[PDB]
Amino acid sequence: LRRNLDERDAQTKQLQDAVTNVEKHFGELCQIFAAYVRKTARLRDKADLLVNEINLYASTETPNLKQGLKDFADEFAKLQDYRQAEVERLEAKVVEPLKAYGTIVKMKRDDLKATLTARNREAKQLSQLERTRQRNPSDRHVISQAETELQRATIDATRTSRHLEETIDNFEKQKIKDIKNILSEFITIEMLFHGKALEVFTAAYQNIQNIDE
Amino acid sequence: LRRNLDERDAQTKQLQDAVTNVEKHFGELCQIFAAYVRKTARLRDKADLLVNEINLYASTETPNLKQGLKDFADEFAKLQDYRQAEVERLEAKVVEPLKAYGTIVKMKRDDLKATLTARNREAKQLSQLERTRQRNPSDRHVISQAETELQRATIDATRTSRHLEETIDNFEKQKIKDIKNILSEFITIEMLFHGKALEVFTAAYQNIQNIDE
Numbered sequence: 001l002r003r004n005l006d007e008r009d010a011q012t013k014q015l016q017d018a019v020t021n022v023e024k025h026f027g028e029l030c031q032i033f034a035a036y037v038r039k040t041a042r043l044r045d046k047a048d049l050l051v052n053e054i055n056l057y058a059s060t061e062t063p064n065l066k067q068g069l070k071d072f073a074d075e076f077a078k079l080q081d082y083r084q085a086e087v088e089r090l091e092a093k094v095v096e097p098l099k100a101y102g103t104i105v106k107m108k109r110d111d112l113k114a115t116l117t118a119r120n121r122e123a124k125q126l127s128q129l130e131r132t133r134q135r136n137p138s139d140r141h142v143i144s145q146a147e148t149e150l151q152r153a154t155i156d157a158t159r160t161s162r163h164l165e166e167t168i169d170n171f172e173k174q175k176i177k178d179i180k181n182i183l184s185e186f187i188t189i190e191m192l193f194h195g196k197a198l199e200v201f202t203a204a205y206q207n208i209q210n211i212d213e
Numbered sequence: 214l215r216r217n218l219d220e221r222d223a224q225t226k227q228l229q230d231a232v233t234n235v236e237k238h239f240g241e242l243c244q245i246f247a248a249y250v251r252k253t254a255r256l257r258d259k260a261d262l263l264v265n266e267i268n269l270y271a272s273t274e275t276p277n278l279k280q281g282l283k284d285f286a287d288e289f290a291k292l293q294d295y296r297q298a299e300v301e302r303l304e305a306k307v308v309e310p311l312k313a314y315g316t317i318v319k320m321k322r323d324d325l326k327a328t329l330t331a332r333n334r335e336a337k338q339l340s341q342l343e344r345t346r347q348r349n350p351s352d353r354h355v356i357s358q359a360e361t362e363l364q365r366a367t368i369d370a371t372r373t374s375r376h377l378e379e380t381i382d383n384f385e386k387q388k389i390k391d392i393k394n395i396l397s398e399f400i401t402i403e404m405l406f407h408g409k410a411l412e413v414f415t416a417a418y419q420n421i422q423n424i425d426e
Contacts (some may be wrong), residue, residue: 025270032266036259043252049245057238065389072396176278176426183285187418194410201404208396213389 004032012161015168016112022175023105030098031160033161033186037090044083064212079200086193097178110170115164118157125153225374228381229325235388244313246399250303257296264290277425280312284420292413299406306398310391321384329379331370338366 051073059068129146137144264286271282342359349355 021273025266025273026290028266029263029270032259032262036256036263039252039256039259043249043256046245046249046252050249053238055239060234060238111293174338176424180421180424180426183421184418187414187421191411191414195416197407198404198411201400201407205397205400208393208400211389211393213393
């Protein structure tokens with residue numbers, strides 16, 4: 001029935017738009033997290049430049065001031081190693097899992113296309129059956145054959161749509177697990193870095209106090 | 214005496230090179246700290262983009278997942294306000310004090326130039342005195358006048374050099390205080406930010422756990 005076909009299509013469009021919504025927003029988050037990683041690395045570069053200049057300036061100075069400056073530079077350089085570990089973990093645990101949704105989305109689009117193909121085959125077999133009844137009204141045999149082929153197309157379309165509903169449902173379940181895990185990893189990777197920074201800067205504060213002024 | 218003038222000049226050259234060494238290295242540190250600040254701000258920009266996308270994606274989602282995402286975005290946005298305070302303090306307490314050494318260096322160069330000028334005047338008055346003795350060997354009056362003017366130039370050069378030694382000595386004392394204070398401020402400003410980040414990310418870890426998966 002026509003009012004049922006409008007409903008059936010609108011419901012598949014929702015599954016289609018559900019895949020698109022994730023493709024769009026996980027993909028945007030993926031680009032932003034990659035840019036966040038690049039900006040973290042570019043900040044590490046400037047911190048390296050500071051380490052080098054403090055060391056070079058320290059090499060020109062009186063002994064106690066030189067030692068205090070080198071000790072600071074040694075601690076701060078340690079912080080940039082932790083920043084490098086933060087960059088690598090963010091690439092592996094945040095950017096790469098979001099990037100993998102390109103392939104997940106492609107597989108869902110195949111399931112959606114198979115459903116559209118099966119429904120076109122069904123609609124074609126239904127129009128075939130009505131035409132065959134009209135051209136050969138009294139040929140029970142060829143009508144029965146067209147009825148049998150419609151029933152095959154119908155159950156194949158139902159089963160293809162039934163599989164689609166299951167894979168999209170699993171896709172939504174895994175979407176929630178993934179976004180929880182991806183943001184959790186981002187939070188713990190950052191927390192690890194900020195905790196190490198506090199350790200480093202606490203010690204660096206001592207090495208500056210020992211500079212005899 | 215000539216061996217004394219080589220010594221006297223080499224010692225003023227050391228004062229001159231001491232001003233240059235600070236000009237060069239405080240100026241390099243100033244440029245690097247400014248670039249470090251710009252890279253911190255550019256990392257804040259990317260974090261803002263993450264806040265916006267998480268909010269926009271959350272506006273499309275089921276109620277519990279939407280709320281969990283918005284709560285994360287609200288906490289992380291709080292972290293970028295602390296990053297903005299870190300940027301402002303680094304500009305005011307680290308970059309600006311290093312930048313102020315352009316003016317300090319200029320004043321020391323004036324003291325150095327006054328010393329060179331006074332020594333040229335002295336050397337000229339000494340050559341004048343020897344010439345006057347040679348052209349008027351028996352004019353005790355004009356010789357005595359040239360001797361008196363040499364003694365004025367000599368004590369003026371001694372006093373100008375004596376003032377130079379005092380201002381460079383004070384300049385070295387203040388250099389050590391300043392570099393200790395500037396690096397201490399950098400360390401405490403960073404420590405403050407990393408401590409606030411730990412607070413924010415600890416709370417953000419809860420808001421992610423409440424997402425029903």
